[PDB]
Amino acid sequence: PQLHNGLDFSAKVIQGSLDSLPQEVRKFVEGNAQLCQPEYIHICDGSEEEYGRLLAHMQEEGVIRKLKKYDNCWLALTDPRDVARIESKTVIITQEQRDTVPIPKSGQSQLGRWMSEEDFEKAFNARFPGCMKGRTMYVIPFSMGPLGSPLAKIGIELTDSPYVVASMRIMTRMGTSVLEALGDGEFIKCLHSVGCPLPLKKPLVNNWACNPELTLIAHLPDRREIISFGSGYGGNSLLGKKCFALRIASRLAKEEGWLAEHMLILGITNPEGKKKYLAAAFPSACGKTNLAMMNPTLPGWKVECVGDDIAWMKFDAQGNLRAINPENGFFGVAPGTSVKTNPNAIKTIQKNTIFTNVAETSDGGVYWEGIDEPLAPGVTITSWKNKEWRPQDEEPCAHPNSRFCTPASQCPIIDPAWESPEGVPIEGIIFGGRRPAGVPLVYEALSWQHGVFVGAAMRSEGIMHDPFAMRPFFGYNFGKYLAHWLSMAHRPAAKLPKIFHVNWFRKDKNGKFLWPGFGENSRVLEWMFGRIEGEDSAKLTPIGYVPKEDALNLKGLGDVNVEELFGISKEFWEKEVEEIDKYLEDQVNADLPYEIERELRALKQRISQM
Numbered sequence: 031p032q033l034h035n036g037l038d039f040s041a042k043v044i045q046g047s048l049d050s051l052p053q054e055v056r057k058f059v060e061g062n063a064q065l066c067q068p069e070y071i072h073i074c075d076g077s078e079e080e081y082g083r084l085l086a087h088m089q090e091e092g093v094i095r096k097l098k099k100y101d102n103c104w105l106a107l108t109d110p111r112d113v114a115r116i117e118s119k120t121v122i123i124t125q126e127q128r129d130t131v132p133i134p135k136s137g138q139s140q141l142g143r144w145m146s147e148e149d150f151e152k153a154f155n156a157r158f159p160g161c162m163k164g165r166t167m168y169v170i171p172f173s174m175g176p177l178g179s180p181l182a183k184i185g186i187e188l189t190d191s192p193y194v195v196a197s198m199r200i201m202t203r204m205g206t207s208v209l210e211a212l213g214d215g216e217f218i219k220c221l222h223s224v225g226c227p228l229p230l231k232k233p234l235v236n237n238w239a240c241n242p243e244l245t246l247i248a249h250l251p252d253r254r255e256i257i258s259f260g261s262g263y264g265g266n267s268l269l270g271k272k273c274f275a276l277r278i279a280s281r282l283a284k285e286e287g288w289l290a291e292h293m294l295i296l297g298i299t300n301p302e303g304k305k306k307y308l309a310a311a312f313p314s315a316c317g318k319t320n321l322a323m324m325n326p327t328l329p330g331w332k333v334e335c336v337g338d339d340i341a342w343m344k345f346d347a348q349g350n351l352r353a354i355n356p357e358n359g360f361f362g363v364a365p366g367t368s369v370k371t372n373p374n375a376i377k378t379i380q381k382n383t384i385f386t387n388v389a390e391t392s393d394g395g396v397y398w399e400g401i402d403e404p405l406a407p408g409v410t411i412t413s414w415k416n417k418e419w420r421p422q423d424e425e426p427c428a429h430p431n432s433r434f435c436t437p438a439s440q441c442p443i444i445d446p447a448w449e450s451p452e453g454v455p456i457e458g459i460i461f462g463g464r465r466p467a468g469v470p471l472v473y474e475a476l477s478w479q480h481g482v483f484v485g486a487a488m489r490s491e492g493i494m495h496d497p498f499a500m501r502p503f504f505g506y507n508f509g510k511y512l513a514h515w516l517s518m519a520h521r522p523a524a525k526l527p528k529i530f531h532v533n534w535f536r537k538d539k540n541g542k543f544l545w546p547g548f549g550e551n552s553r554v555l556e557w558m559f560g561r562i563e564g565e566d567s568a569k570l571t572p573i574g575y576v577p578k579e580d581a582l583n584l585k586g587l588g589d590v591n592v593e594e595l596f597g598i599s600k601e602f603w604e605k606e607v608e609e610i611d612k613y614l615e616d617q618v619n620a621d622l623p624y625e626i627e628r629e630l631r632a633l634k635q636r637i638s639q640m
């Protein structure tokens with residue numbers, strides 16, 4: 031079957047068997063083994079044994095450190111050049127640019143980054159040949175979604191990073207059972223290299239292999255391929271998360287009639303035992319993880335977490351919008367995480383957790399800005415840069431984007447349906463972001479079409495547009511994504527969720543937050559809940575429905591300045607509509623659906639009557 035030894039890499043397999051793999055998977059592995067030239071091939075089985083040995087191996091090499099204070103928890107410190115998902119190096123390849131991003135009138139799209147097939151081929155050839163020399167290629171069979179669920183999708187990731195292997199074991203369902211469920215089915219092809227073949231051409235920093243100059247995270251949806259080079263971090267390297275479950279998946283979703291979104295999913299139960307599920311899209315750094323795992327301050331209310339970051343949603347036969355969490359764990363921002371802001375996260379992460387770029391205490395615990403836990407006198411701190419640190423220093427002890435990576439099943443409020451194969455029925459969708467001025471705590475959209483316009487108008491900070499929290503994550507043209515959302519209104523018998531917009535971040539004139547937030551947000555969720563039940567608790571305004579006077583439970587919060595928090599200004603909202611106008615005109619133009627344009631004019635009109 032070959033004249034020499036062919037593309038047959040059996041001799042280099044140190045775990046599992048190429049014979050055992052489905053034909054197409056074997057082909058994927060062996061093709062990239064020939065290209066990348068790894069010294070060893072490790073087919074992951076997902077076992078506890080494989081995992082313990084992987085960690086020991088990394089520990090042995092100084093790639094990770096054990097955090098002796100906790101049960102099976104580990105710390106990685108990275109090269110300071112590789113500390114986040116990196117948008118500027120993130121691209122989607124399609125035949126025509128306009129299928130990927132709308133053509134901006136001012137020459138630069140904030141809605142994606144296209145690369146031609148030709149330019150990518152050249153970039154690929156400049157990077158991958160021999161890139162794994164001297165390393166192990168790990169083969170990670172993973173399912174996004176509960177194994178065997180009709181909403182689940184399988185990928186194979188090849189990586190030269192054991193850190194990616196460990197993190198993927200947490201954040202996806204990984205191992206032999208996935209290969210068995212796969213059979214001879216289709217899978218997303220995920221290729222990753224840290225881009226540092228041996229012998230090293232450049233010095234290794236903090237035992238963290240990366241290639242910042244050649245970093246390139248590419249998606250080729252027409253080939254069902256994700257190809258990522260040069261970063262070992264987060265969304266650049268854990269390919270199932272953003273690359274697959276948002277970018278690749280949002281385009282599949284458009285073609286197939288479902289949705290793949292940057293949304294938490296939570297189940298909330300009232301004092302009468304009535305439960306509803308909600309989904310919420312907030313941009314990175316705007317508090318999805320706090321809400322998803324909320325400990326409600328209101329007596330007799332309960333919040334349970336389905337997922338904190340990504341939602342796959344599809345209408346069922348009865349018109350219910352069903353959502354699954356395609357993730358298996360939580361990859362949450364560590365700083366700011368405290369008993370006060372996220373007690374349930376505090377409990378989840380003290381075992382079987384990997385931390386990246388946090389500080390370490392001298393008794394082997396973790397530390398970060400906003401942890402709000404004083405240390406005993408004499409306990410000292412090693413920063414994420416691996417030097418002694420004191421609370422007086424200029425720099426933070428933890429990187430602002432440092433993360434924990436923790437099993438979802440350990441969360442004390444994990445939803446009983448968090449793995450149900452049919453998904454949970456969504457009754458409300460919440461949008462929101464950071465709006466220091468002008469936008470009140472909570473409003474309700476007037477219609478599905480107004481709701482989609484409200485998603486389109488979202489912000490990650492007072493000055494930055496992040497429609498639907500998907501700005502860095504659209505798998506195709508944003509204009510067509512709006513058309514896809516609007517199309518859900520025409521699905522016969524669809525039970526369309528109520529759409530709300532929240533704002534935790536309104537400030538008074540001295541910069542102080544007007545709303546205490548966190549667990550207190552339960553008071554906003556109570557209102558949404560009654561609204562879905564059709565309670566007469568809403569007052570119409572030009573921006574949507576707001577809570578009536580007295581509608582919100584504010585007991586315990588008498589110091590809240592209700593007039594400023596809930597206030598609507600004609601002058602603010604005139605500015606807002608003009609801003610939205612310019613933005614949509616510049617960024618979306620020819621691709622903007624009629625309905626979005628009509629909502630813009632309708633809001634303008636309502637404001638004009640103030």
Ligand SMILES: Nc1nc2c(ncn2[C@@H]2O[C@H](COP(=O)(O)OP(=O)(O)OP(=O)(O)O)[C@@H](O)[C@H]2O)c(=O)[nH]1
Nearest residue numbers: 313314315316317318319320363366534543547548
């Ligand atoms: N004022 C206020 N801040 C909040 C609230 N909830 C979350 N935050 C802030 O939001 C940040 C934490 O949110 P992140 O974990 O970064 O957000 P995320 O949406 O989960 O982001 P990704 O994991 O990157 O998708 C911190 O600055 C928190 O203080 C709230 O109710 N009020």
Ligand SMILES: O=C(O)C(=O)CS(=O)(=O)O
Nearest residue numbers: 115264265271272314339
């Ligand atoms: O940036 C985000 O929204 C994240 O959830 C982190 S990463 O998975 O993109 O690293």
Ligand SMILES: [Mn+2]
Nearest residue numbers: 318319362363
């Ligand atoms: Mn998060």
Ligand SMILES: [Mn+2]
Nearest residue numbers: 292313314339
């Ligand atoms: Mn996210």
Ligand code: NA
Nearest residue numbers: 107108236237
């Ligand atoms: Na390190």
